[PDB]
Design a binder for these strands. Sequence first.
DNA 1: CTGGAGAATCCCGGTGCCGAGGCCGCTCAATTGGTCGTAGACAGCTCTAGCACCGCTTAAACGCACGTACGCGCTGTCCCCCGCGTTTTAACCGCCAAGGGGATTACTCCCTAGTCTCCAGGGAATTCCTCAATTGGTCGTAGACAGCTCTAGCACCGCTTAAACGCACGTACGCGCTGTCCCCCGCGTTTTAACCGCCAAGGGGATTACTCCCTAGTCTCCAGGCACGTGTCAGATATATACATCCTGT
DNA 2: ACAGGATGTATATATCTGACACGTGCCTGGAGACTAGGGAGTAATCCCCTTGGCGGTTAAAACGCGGGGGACAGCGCGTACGTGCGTTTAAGCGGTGCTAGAGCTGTCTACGACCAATTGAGGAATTCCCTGGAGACTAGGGAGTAATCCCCTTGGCGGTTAAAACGCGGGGGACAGCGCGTACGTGCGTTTAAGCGGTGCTAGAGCTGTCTACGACCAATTGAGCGGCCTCGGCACCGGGATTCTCCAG
Lengths: 96, 95, 95, 90, 89, 91, 103, 103, 109, 80, 78, 77, 74, 73
Amino acid sequence: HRYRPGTVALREIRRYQKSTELLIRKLPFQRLVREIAQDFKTDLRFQSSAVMALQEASEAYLVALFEDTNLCAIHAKRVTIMPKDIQLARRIRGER
Amino acid sequence: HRYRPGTVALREIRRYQKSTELLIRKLPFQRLVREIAQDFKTDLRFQSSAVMALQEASEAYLVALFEDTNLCAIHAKRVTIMPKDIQLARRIRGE
Amino acid sequence: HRYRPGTVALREIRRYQKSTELLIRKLPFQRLVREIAQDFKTDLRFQSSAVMALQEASEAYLVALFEDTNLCAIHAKRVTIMPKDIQLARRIRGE
Amino acid sequence: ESYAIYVYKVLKQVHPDTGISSKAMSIMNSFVNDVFERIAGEASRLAHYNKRSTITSREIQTAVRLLLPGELAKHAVSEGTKAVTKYTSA
Amino acid sequence: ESYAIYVYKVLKQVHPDTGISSKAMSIMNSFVNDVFERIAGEASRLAHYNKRSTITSREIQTAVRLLLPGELAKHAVSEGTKAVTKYTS
Amino acid sequence: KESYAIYVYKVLKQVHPDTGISSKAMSIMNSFVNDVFERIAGEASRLAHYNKRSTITSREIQTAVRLLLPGELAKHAVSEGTKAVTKYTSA
Amino acid sequence: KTRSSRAGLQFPVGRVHRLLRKGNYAERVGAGAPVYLAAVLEYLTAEILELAGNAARDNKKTRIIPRHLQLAVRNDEELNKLLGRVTIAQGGVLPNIQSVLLP
Amino acid sequence: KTRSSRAGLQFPVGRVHRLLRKGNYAERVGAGAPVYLAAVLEYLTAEILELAGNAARDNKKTRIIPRHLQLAVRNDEELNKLLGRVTIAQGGVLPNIQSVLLP
Amino acid sequence: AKTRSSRAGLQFPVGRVHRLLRKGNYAERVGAGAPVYLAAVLEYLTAEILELAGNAARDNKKTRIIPRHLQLAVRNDEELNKLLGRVTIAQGGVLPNIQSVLLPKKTES
Amino acid sequence: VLRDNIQGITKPAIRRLARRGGVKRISGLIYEETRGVLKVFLENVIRDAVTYTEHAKRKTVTAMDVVYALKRQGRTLYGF
Amino acid sequence: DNIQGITKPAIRRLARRGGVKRISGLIYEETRGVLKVFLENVIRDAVTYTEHAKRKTVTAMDVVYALKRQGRTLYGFG
Amino acid sequence: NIQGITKPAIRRLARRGGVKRISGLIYEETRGVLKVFLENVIRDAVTYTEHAKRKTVTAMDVVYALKRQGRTLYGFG
Amino acid sequence: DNIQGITKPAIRRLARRGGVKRISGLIYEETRGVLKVFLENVIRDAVTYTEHAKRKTVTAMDVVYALKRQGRTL
Amino acid sequence: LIRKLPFQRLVREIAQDFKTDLRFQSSAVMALQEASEAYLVALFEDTNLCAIHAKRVTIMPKDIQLARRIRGE
DNA sequence: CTGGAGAATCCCGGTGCCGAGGCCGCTCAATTGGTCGTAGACAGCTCTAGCACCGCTTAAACGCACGTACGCGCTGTCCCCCGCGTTTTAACCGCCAAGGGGATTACTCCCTAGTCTCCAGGGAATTCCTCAATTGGTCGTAGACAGCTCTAGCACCGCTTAAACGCACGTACGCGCTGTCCCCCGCGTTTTAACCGCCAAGGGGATTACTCCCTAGTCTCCAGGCACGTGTCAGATATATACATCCTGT
DNA sequence: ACAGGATGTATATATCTGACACGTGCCTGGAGACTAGGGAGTAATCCCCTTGGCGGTTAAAACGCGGGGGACAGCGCGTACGTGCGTTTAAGCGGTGCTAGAGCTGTCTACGACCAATTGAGGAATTCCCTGGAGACTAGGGAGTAATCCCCTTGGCGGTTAAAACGCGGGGGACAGCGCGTACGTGCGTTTAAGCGGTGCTAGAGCTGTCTACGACCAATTGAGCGGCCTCGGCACCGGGATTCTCCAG
């Protein structure tokens, strides 16, 4: 059968709120941060704990942003998040 | 219409090198002279020609120091004068 | 073994700033003094202390000049002194 | 250089049976370092503003009353006062 | 003639154990003669500016205030006046 | 009271008989003449004293001028001085 | 006997004195300063460890872990005001979804 | 009769002699000293007034002005050598701009 | 008889200073107080020089003042340095000094 | 390294991030927007970390350099 | 106080007569400090002459004697 | 002649002056500056010797020439 | 009592300065609330600076030290 | 932009919670007034953005408290 | 609305692995004790500034009425997001090798300190001689002290006018980074001149003595220079027109 | 890159005002003459220093080479400086008014110079003794320069399994349109309180001086904390069964 759309979303929310693991794959993020850093210093090196700290800070930041954008979406009386919600949250946060 | 940066500078360099006026306003300078003298003697009087002699010597000193500063700026490949140029010029002049 | 460029130059600076003896050879300078004098008046004699007074004053002048040209080199953001540093130093001194 | 032995000695009296993981111990080290350095920062700013060369309990007390929220402050300055008056009486 | 015995007597006052080289002593002679020429020539110039015929202690006092740096001047004038008021005592 | 103005004016009316001079420029010329006088007389004084002799003669003035003035300005100054002394004493 | 036991503290007064000296916070440090500061640090440590240990016990765990520190800090509104700009490594999020999303 | 006319001078030999004797320059003054000195003062006066009258004429002025005395002294390198440490009140500067500053 | 130096309390010769003030033709007249004042000033300046030069000698662990120690004295006391700014001490050296830009050392903190 | 490893921050992972953020549904334009804001978040922290590494004149960015970069950015990370 | 009456424009005029094309904004305070040091060195000498004259009025001749003593002679003021 | 003032001597003088590094054109420039200084001093020392009606140049004529040049030498009377 | 001293037209001006076109009648009370806590969060710190000086007058320096602290926490 | 006296009275009435017979410099009150007005203007700007985002021109208290929440007040 | 079916989650039990907790030894930091100097506390004084009160004016706020605009609710339609299945790709883990850095170690050179010996030179003492310094008296002038008059300096006010200050905007210059090539430094080897040192000779400077000429001082007389008044001429200021240079648009 | 337009400067003319030039009168300074003294000049002699040569040895200079580091050029980016405009402020000019201080004159006394005599100090010479510095040798330490080693992370490779990637259908959500009622704004009148000015008072702030206690610094000793190692327990994972939640059909 089909679960009604949105119920499996609520189930997914519940499981990812009750669990503390890292949600981004580690190696793609390590490649991303090495790509970003290689623009600033050609032969730079990282501690693995530095990549881990960057991942923890990035995921915490994105999660709290998605919280503020869900607040913006709910305020406009709709449930779908849209880019104008990220843009409003960030503009009110002043973090442009 | 706007003149390019430095076009009006060269024009007024040519102006102020052609003329011989005093360039500091006279009352401000006189009040400065009296303020400095007040630290040396109270109730002191000045002849007006003593103020004019001080202003002439002061402005000739500053113009000459600016010439040495400009030579210092040019030596470092700059065209803007900076405080390190005045400090160098006054160092080499021994003062 | 080889010391790296500038290590010995700094040991020499410390050596010569510590000492006081005259750094030009005496006979070459005495011959220079005599050749320069020969153009003003022929068959002048010199007291040996006159040649020493000339040497002392000349070395003190050259050292005091090199300190200013070193300052001008540093101001141009380089450590090698260049003839244009001597020329700037002498111009700012007004020589 | 770690506070871990002191975090244990506080833990074994606030919860005598409970243990703590080293990944939580390094968080506790981070917390006490952050609170130490921010309290010392505000005490330094207060001393400088008052033109005082010396940091004393009177500076730290007001740094705590600035940094901590009202009831955490009210308890913190009570424990601090009691500890200082015990130290001076001993 | 030279100041060497007086430079030596003041050396024995300031540093009784220390000696001085004959080449340092000749530098002290040059120093004393230079400072004398400076002070006396300024006292004469200043006397002439005021149409005076006489070098007095007042001209020497203002000469040392002109020539000596302010802190050296402040002590030099007090040594001068102390000497004059002792002499005229 | 004491000024060179009429003699500077006589020299001006000799070298440029059509030209005039402002009183500010005349006072500059007076300051110039007094400064050069004081330089030469001071150097001749020091030079007479150095040789331990009581008198300032034309020879001290000549040597003072040779020290103070540069180059050909000195050569002409001494030629004019000696010409004047010769015309004076031969009179 | 150590100044901590004189003051009645577990936290090290001597170490806090060193760390105040070596931080150049001011050129002089009074004798009561490290006793007051060590007593405040011990207080805040005991308070957070009390809350975290309760959260651990409510999870039926014998051992405190970063999750329980996050739960403690976010459930206490006052530590939450103290630690508002703080991220705790693998602390996760305080479970919450609003009734506008629920059916 | 007068000593200036005997020497052939415009400048006053008698006043130069007076100023030498009232000047404490030396305890005696020879008779040729004021003649030689007056003749040098006259030569240098004529040299400056000549260069100043050239500058005045080039500026189409009929009168010497301190500007013209400055132009005279500073354009002649030997007067500028003599008067290097001297400034002329209400004289200006020589027009000059460095080639690095010109376009 | 008693010397004017000992009457004034000076080591420097007041009579010689008076003679030199007359002989040097500084003015027609020289008042009786000018020699005493000038001798006192010259003695003071000499004592200042020899104090600083004796300190420089002692710091070098030397028993004898030499031109080096006079140069170190004059050039380390800024008042003497600006009194003696246009003067060179024969057989004195220079103050040891090197511009920091020339030195290789770094903080690397 | 490859030019576009930002595409390694995959749509499912952004969806998981939005789930922990409490979001029930997300429009398909959110993914590129999120990759944008992530890139601009990361690169300024990487810059500050490199600044600290160069101030220490060291070959490596350490975890303490990241922690100081975040602290000066105004976000404090405990546990490193 | 009154040193601020030596305005930025006047210093720019003085620098332009000196042939200066561009002037960094930090030069003005540097210039005022340099002028205040110069004036006080001359006036200290000028008032020393007035006190020696036992006058209350500084005359132009006291200024000229101070300047020439400072090693720089001014023509035009007697 | 002026080649008697050798490159090593000018190096030593520059070391005493605190100069760390010296371009090869400095030696001729320094020989020119030294020769001009000596000419300017010796001309005055010889003028003082001529005025004295004398033909040995004394150390005192050098000291007087230097004093006139505005740079005073201590140690030779 | 005195928070009603921050009157309806004054808030309307502050909003129109902020570019607000229309204001619902509930906003004035809400604005009074947010203003009241802002002042409390600043004045309280200013009074701890004055008490640390043992002064009895709050100075402008204490106000700006409080404001720069609140702005740093803000 | 706020009247001076009513704001001064409000500052007195707040301060008298924390200390008694406390006194204020005439410029301390003005510093508080101008900081308060600047804070309120910036808040009304964030409110007007939240209102415009709801397709709505009239600002409402849900907009103020959204802005405050998103700012983290 | 109610009941049944299917999917997902939770709970219980066993096993394994890694981390937590404890034990032991050593080193470094904490404590203890003494000394010293300065910061802070305490006291007193002064005076600004804050608080309180009163009156008047006018602008602002408040209250109510009116009317339209905007918010909200309802309805419809279309789009795009979700969920599921299948396929495809990359993450994760384990293993191995090499480079890169960081730290440590070794080696060599140079500087400094101590010791010993030798040289010189400096200092002290003594004696003798000469010149300057001191003392005392006299005489003349310079400076001080007082009186008087006039000028210039200082203060104030009123006004205009041009300069200075504030702000906005855009571009150019300054600063930093990177690469390459040349020139200078460090060093070894060879060559040359400088320095020590003595000897010889002549010239030049110094000293002494005598004589002559030059300058200073004094007195008298005449002319020149300075001061003041008047007249004339050149320079300054204002306005108009032309020419040159730079900036902007195609 | 080129051409055209605009802006700024220079040149010409006229008028007005101030400064320069000339003449006259009076007072002071210079010139002329004579007298007296010493300084300058000249001549002779003697002594010392400078100049020149010779010889040898050692240190310094010169000459060449290799490599490294710095200088120079090129490029890019960001902020500061320049140019324009408007508004405000102060300088400059003119006029008034008053007083202080500058400048001059006269008178009188003390100070300084000059002269003579006498005495002491300083300088010069000689001899002797002691100390300090210099030179050489020896040893140790520190700095400079290069290598070694060890450990950590990137790189590569293999394989398997889970995740994501892709496609499709349906359902829910988003967006739009329309209608209506309420609420916000706006207008007017009346009222009220803010703003401003003035007056009076006190208590807090600021500052200065003094003295004691507190904290820092230095040295020595001891205990605690950290590092390394070992053992056991707790938690997580896996497997199975039951329960709970959700969806569809009657």
